[PDB]
Amino acid sequence: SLRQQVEALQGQVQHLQAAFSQYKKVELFPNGQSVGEKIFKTAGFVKPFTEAQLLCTQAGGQLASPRSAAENAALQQLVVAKNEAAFLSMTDSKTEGKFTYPTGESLVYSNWAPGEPNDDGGSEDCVEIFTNGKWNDRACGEKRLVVCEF
Amino acid sequence: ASLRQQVEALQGQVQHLQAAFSQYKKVELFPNGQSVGEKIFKTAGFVKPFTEAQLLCTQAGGQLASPRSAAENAALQQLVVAKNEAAFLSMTDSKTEGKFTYPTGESLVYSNWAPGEPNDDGGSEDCVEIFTNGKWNDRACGEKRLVVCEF
Amino acid sequence: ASLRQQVEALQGQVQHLQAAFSQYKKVELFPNGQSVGEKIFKTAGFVKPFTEAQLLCTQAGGQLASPRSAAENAALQQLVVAKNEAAFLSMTDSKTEGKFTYPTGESLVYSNWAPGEPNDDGGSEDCVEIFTNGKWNDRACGEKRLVVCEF
Ligand SMILES: OC[C@H]1O[C@H](O[C@H]2[C@H](O)[C@@H](O)[C@@H](O)O[C@@H]2CO)[C@H](O)[C@@H](O)[C@@H]1O
Ligand SMILES: OC[C@H]1O[C@H](O)[C@H](O)[C@@H](O)[C@@H]1O
Ligand SMILES: OC[C@H]1O[C@H](O)[C@H](O)[C@@H](O)[C@@H]1O
Ligand SMILES: [Ca+2]
Ligand SMILES: [Ca+2]
Ligand SMILES: [Ca+2]
Ligand SMILES: [Ca+2]
Ligand SMILES: [Ca+2]
Ligand SMILES: [Ca+2]
Ligand SMILES: [Ca+2]
Ligand SMILES: [Ca+2]
Ligand SMILES: [Ca+2]
């Protein structure tokens, strides 16, 4: 009887593994990107930093925070796809000139475009990623593509 | 020993599925879904007249948003606020004027009518819309409102 | 009997996961997807020329919509009707004019050509589009059509 039940359970699990794998592909198309254990997903629209940040946190995640070249490339795919620069999670709002993650830790990876960050006009504390994958500090009030990570 | 080994194996596979699925649930609901209790509201993102909206939800295996508690109503309101578009609820008093029911015919177990509503304005309001402030108003079924289904 | 209870526990978890997964699958398909058999069609919601559309589907781990039966075609038609935009199918006759094949080079096992099609108009129609009425027409691969992938 146990052997009978174990077999039924094995089949149920195998079915779920197959169904789940197909479902993951469906979910990620066309607004998501999986890289490592991280998943980037764009909302498809633009918002200023504070609004974008709240949407991500309320959804149980946070604004895109690429921590490696591999993550940045995955994120860049969505930006290129929507042809819209996106906001990253990092800012130097606390200490001008020092960009940090929402936790408060210092950047462990960066991909600044030449000359950036430059605090243009003395008011750029947020970061945007261009279609070429490079970063630029930009005013938090501007509207950029919303991309969260989970 | 084999059965034991088999069981332990299944344990690890199930743990992987649960963790992987837990992540995908969050990804899926962003930005058009809202989970509340065991119910999930999902907006189509566009507006349609009542009959069209209702068919979309039913064919999808669900039904139009039917908040049955203040918590469910507040969750649905979040989507309405996000899209900034009032949405249709599933309930109507099409059978018996003044008596609103769910698609199953059951009487309402919760309501959040704006003051003075429902008022059957113009003698022709049998459907219900929820505003960005979460309050309800009976409205003509021919009007176009945000489509939100529950699953 | 410790394995009996362990198996009992694991199954409850598995069945709860099955229920949650089923609910999330319905949510996922609303309103841009359609399930038919073991196949799932999902539209990106925008249009693109054939080559770009084909790349999007393959990079996503799938391929362009390839209806292989009347049932599959009807499901795909639902999405085309909903978006009110004709979509590209995966099949082409680029290798041998007049002979349409799936990306694998295999010959069609089902077709739903509109009357008079395929006609290779202008001597340059090697791709296929499906209309809101479900019928097919060969069309120039450079045209932009709704992107629908199958998984
Ligand atoms: O454009 C290629 C397409 O042309 C014809 O279809 C026309 C149709 O005749 C017009 O009435 C209108 O619907 O525009 C269509 C697209 O131009 C051919 O019938 C068709 O075979 C061909 O692919
Ligand atoms: O307008 C704001 C932007 O202008 C230019 O692109 C500058 O190179 C950049 O640093 C700045 O953020
Ligand atoms: O125009 C229709 C609506 O007009 C106003 O909002 C009334 O307060 C409301 O009761 C009615 O349904
Ligand atoms: Ca500053
Ligand atoms: Ca700054
Ligand atoms: Ca700058
Ligand atoms: Ca009436
Ligand atoms: Ca009425
Ligand atoms: Ca009213
Ligand atoms: Ca040809
Ligand atoms: Ca041809
Ligand atoms: Ca033709």
Short account of what is shown:
The structure is a homotrimer. By secondary structure, chain A is α+β, with helices and mostly antiparallel strands. Chain A contains three helices and seven strands; from the N terminus they run αββαβαββββ.
List keywords for this structure.
homotrimer, 150 residues, alpha+beta, Mannose-Binding Protein A, Chain A, 4-stranded antiparallel β-sheet, 3-stranded antiparallel β-sheet, 34% helix, 25% strand, binds a molecule of 2 linked components (GLC-GLC), binds alpha-D-glucopyranose, binds calcium ion, signaling protein, collectin, c-type lectin, alpha-helical coiled coil
Write structural notes for this entry.
The PDB classes it as signaling protein. 3 copies of one chain form a homotrimer. Chain A is of the alpha+beta class and 150 residues long. The first copy, chain A, has a single domain, classed as Mannose-Binding Protein A, subunit A (Mannose-Binding Protein A, Chain A, Roll), CATH 3.10.100. Helix content of chain A is 34%, strand content 25%. Chain A binds chain B through residues 2-3, 6, 9-10, 13, 16-17, 20, 23-24, 27, 32, 39, 41, 43-44, 55-56, 59-61, 146, 148, 150, and chain B through 3, 6-7, 10, 13-14, 17, 20-21, 23-24, 26-31. The structure holds a molecule of 2 linked components (GLC-GLC), alpha-D-glucopyranose (2 copies) and calcium ion (CA) (9 copies).
